[PDB]
Amino acid sequence: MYGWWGRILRVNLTTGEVKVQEYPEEVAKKFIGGRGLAAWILWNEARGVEPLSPENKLIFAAGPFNGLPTPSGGKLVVAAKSPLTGGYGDGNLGTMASVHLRRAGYDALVVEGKAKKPVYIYIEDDNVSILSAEGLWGKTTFETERELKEIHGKNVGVLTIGPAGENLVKYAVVISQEGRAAGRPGMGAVMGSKKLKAVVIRGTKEIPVADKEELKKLSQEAYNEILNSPGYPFWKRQGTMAAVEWCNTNYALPTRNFSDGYFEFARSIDGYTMEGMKVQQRGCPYCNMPCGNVVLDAEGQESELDYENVALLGSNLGIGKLNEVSVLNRIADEMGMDTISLGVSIAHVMEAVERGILKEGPTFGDFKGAKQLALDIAYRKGELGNLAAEGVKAMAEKLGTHDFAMHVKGLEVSGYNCYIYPAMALAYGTSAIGAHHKEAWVIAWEIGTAPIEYKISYDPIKAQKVVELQRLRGGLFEMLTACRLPWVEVGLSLDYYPKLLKAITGVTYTWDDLYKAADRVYSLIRAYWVREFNGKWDRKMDYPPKRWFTEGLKSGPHKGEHLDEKKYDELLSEYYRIRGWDERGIPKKETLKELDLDFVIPELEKVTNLE
Amino acid sequence: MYGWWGRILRVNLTTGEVKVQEYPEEVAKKFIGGRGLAAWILWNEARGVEPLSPENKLIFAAGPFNGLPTPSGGKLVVAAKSPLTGGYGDGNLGTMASVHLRRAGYDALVVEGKAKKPVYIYIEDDNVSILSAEGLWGKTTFETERELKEIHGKNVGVLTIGPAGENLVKYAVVISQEGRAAGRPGMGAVMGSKKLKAVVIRGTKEIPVADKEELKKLSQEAYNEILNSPGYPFWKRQGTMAAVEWCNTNYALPTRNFSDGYFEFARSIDGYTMEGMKVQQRGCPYCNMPCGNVVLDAEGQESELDYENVALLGSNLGIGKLNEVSVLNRIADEMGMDTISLGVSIAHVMEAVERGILKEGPTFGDFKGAKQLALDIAYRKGELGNLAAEGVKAMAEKLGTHDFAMHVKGLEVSGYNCYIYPAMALAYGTSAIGAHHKEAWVIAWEIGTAPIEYKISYDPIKAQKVVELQRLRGGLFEMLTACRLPWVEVGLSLDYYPKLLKAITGVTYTWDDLYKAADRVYSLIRAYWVREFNGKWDRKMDYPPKRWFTEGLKSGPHKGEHLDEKKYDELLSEYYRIRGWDERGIPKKETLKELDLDFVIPELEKVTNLE
């Protein structure tokens, strides 16, 4: 076997037992890795279990691409049954943990059970131990990693959670190298429910590559393509921050709980501003186009800014000062909590206050008030903090504010307001893990322009794009697993991947073979949601926030415009027609059979009638 | 006598003698104050003196508006025969030292001679002493003021010099309240040559006011007008920083030693960027539209930004990040040196390195190298820091680089590139104190738009608008002396100034009275220049830098466009005709008499032939 190790390190914090699981090569080829392997493991190992119970599984899934020097391939997936959604949840992050874990002889690491007290996992090649972390508990992500490296050395990849993860804040994430995060659906709160404070990994093994010479050839070639791309220079200057002005220009910038798509103070939180405030630039391993743009916040503190962070914690909260937003950014990072859901849950809170629905809390534009709630959310201090820490879906059920509850399947919506963007809306509506732009960033194609540089329509070809995009973004790249920005941003050729995959694993994959795996992973994940939801499922699960229907843009040429329920629904059907799912959103026996997923049928058959 | 005290404080550092000179009421009425009063003094007392010798007079001249609550009337002028230009030089700065000086019973303070050791002047009403400052010498202006306040309390006005003054950097200035500055022509280098480290003032006296009730009402009315003007909200947001975009939009932004009028990275150093980097806002005494905007620099240090600082230290140096320009900004402030002349002297070096004339030194964009040269200049470290500390005119004489020496009369050009702006060019060419935009910021009128929100022409009416602007900017406002911005930026009616003066001094000044007074100040100063230049003088002293005539814009639709000498010469002649000067730029006998300057004629007649 080449590329894959075919080994999965298993760590039980309840029994303290550490073993290595050897899975079949066919399963490697079948799911390639990352989200694929993760999906495979959760179907089998996380059946009907509570997301915060010790029976849940936390998976750090890598891919054949990881551990080896491949263009921006130092990513990693973190999965487990989500405490936020209740279905499948996963995330990605660039970190040396990815390089060191695969070089330590593992394709993934699964963690079950829960420690009786705070602990951290230590992994150095074949030496794996569960050590006491009693002294780290309570510390920020930054400090935790720093102290651990002060002990073991700089040559280790470190994964940690902050108080937010510790206090089981619903959308807690996992952090690495101060800035890289993973797991919006609550991978951090799962890690936290297990009293697992961190993970330190060190690898030195030589990974078996089928064709060594071709890997160096392809990689070296892919880098140069990236370096000479016309988009390199600008990317290097603004990274994802360049979407701020772009989204404002297109009325897609979420402002005050997605109320409007235009923020009057975009310019003071935009990319050029970020540029004149940049003091450092970091990146994930093996990437020659770093986009970890670090600035100094309002308190002179370093803060790594990303578009999604600035949009949900900036324009979305009515705060138009980068130095200030950056302060909220840094807090989410050290507390270990998703910028998007945090910024969305606080925005939700801000509107309920202006509506007089909530007696107290910060309102739009209140920076100091927002900073306070964020910290209270992290430490779950106060009734409000404890509520906003549960996400907008849950918080809304309690308050009775589903009107402006911006989520899908439980997960809070990203930074693209789709009042007049059907394909993007459908992308949020169908995301495999809940509202997120990860899998289908169709908005750029839907408009015709891109940040690196209009008529509404529900043409059923839009659904086709989403599906095609999902296959690559929420599929191929979430399985290799590698960064998709070299392609999405500077236009690196997608041909390098099938060729690199063959140079590594020695297996030849046709783009059609890959689409199948991606479509396979999507039907298995959907299957998971259904099984876990106990057959309680219908096409509405795939619906965008009601607000994109009953309300409209509040300014500009498209003032008053929005999405239409009928045409959206008709577009959902096209999506289901292309995926092979029934009108309920569930795969059909022919599709499950067709995708090598027969074992799923009897199981879904036990919860509902299949088609 | 009302308004004026008719009293001037005299301190002789050499002999230590301290007295109070009484000056006539026609002298006050005649010259009103500030710059008016300073010119009368310099003409009489700084005859033939070495700008850096003990005989030179350091004047701190206030006016009828100072010491009283007048709209943004907390200004003060600093004058002396200039060390950089060799002619009449002066500056203006907002400082509590303006209020306290007048509340102590003085209209102005005149330091002469030279202390035998570091000393500072202490003033508290009638108690005036020359104290030892031996423990202060060497410390930054910021630190000097903080330390003195820790001793005498916060309720005082402090004026200081930094090591640039101490070391006699030719464009050394006087600083106050970290940020406020005065004296581009080297007032700080004169303060330093006297071994004078600071001046602490405190006043408690009540100033005689002709009409107490009117002054109140007029002031209350002026502030509200400011508060309600449409441009107020935006002025509060960007201050003078709004001039970067607007200047870039008009090809007026000095870029790489005035090489171009456009900067490709202007955005990351603009008012919107600044806006999102703002942590504090300060202002001068008695102003309800504060504009001292404080940002955090690349090093986390507070920096007070003003358009001119960012233009000559940013885009002019080819440095496109605002946090890095702010760093250079802070250095200027704490070292006590004019941001403008420092930036121009540096850009000149940068262009000199690039062209290979200089074998060592920084280049455009080299922030680290510019910061080092800036510190090397303040401390006069090395042949380079030493040459640069002399200004571009002197530096150019040494390097033989007259071609890209951006100065007029020895004083370096401001933040407005005039390849295609004949009025502004005439403004710099005729500025009383040498190149500056203080007296005539005509560029806005010439374009038809202003920052608070094209065909080249040499219409002789342009020479009229300059003279008109000078009467107000380089006259009325430097004599009162009050801030011009409330009128210039938000548009406060200029009609409050003649009424307020009247309500304070009791005298009725009509606009023609003011135009005559300002004109007197202009002919007197020119007189000073000619006399001190020993009759060696001609129209070329009023010419803009050669670069704008033999080179043109390098980009945009005006690419290649430049200024026509012949047509400019004609514009200058219209200027001399209007002012009543000969084709040599020297006042005409009939003109002097006309302005009550007969006493100038016998004196000038000793060096040249009058007309």
Ligand SMILES: O=C(O)CCCC(=O)O
């Ligand atoms: O700006 C974003 O959040 C998305 C960047 C492009 C991508 O998702 O691939």
Ligand SMILES: O=C(O)CCCC(=O)O
């Ligand atoms: O932007 C500047 O430097 C000038 C502001 C307007 C004025 O000079 O009055």
Ligand code: SF4
């Ligand atoms: S482009 Fe950005 S997210 Fe992608 S690998 Fe490079 S630094 Fe990481």
Ligand code: SF4
């Ligand atoms: S407008 Fe600015 S410079 Fe003028 S008095 Fe006010 S704070 Fe000072």
Ligand SMILES: [Ca+2]
């Ligand atoms: Ca980040």
Ligand SMILES: [Ca+2]
């Ligand atoms: Ca200043």
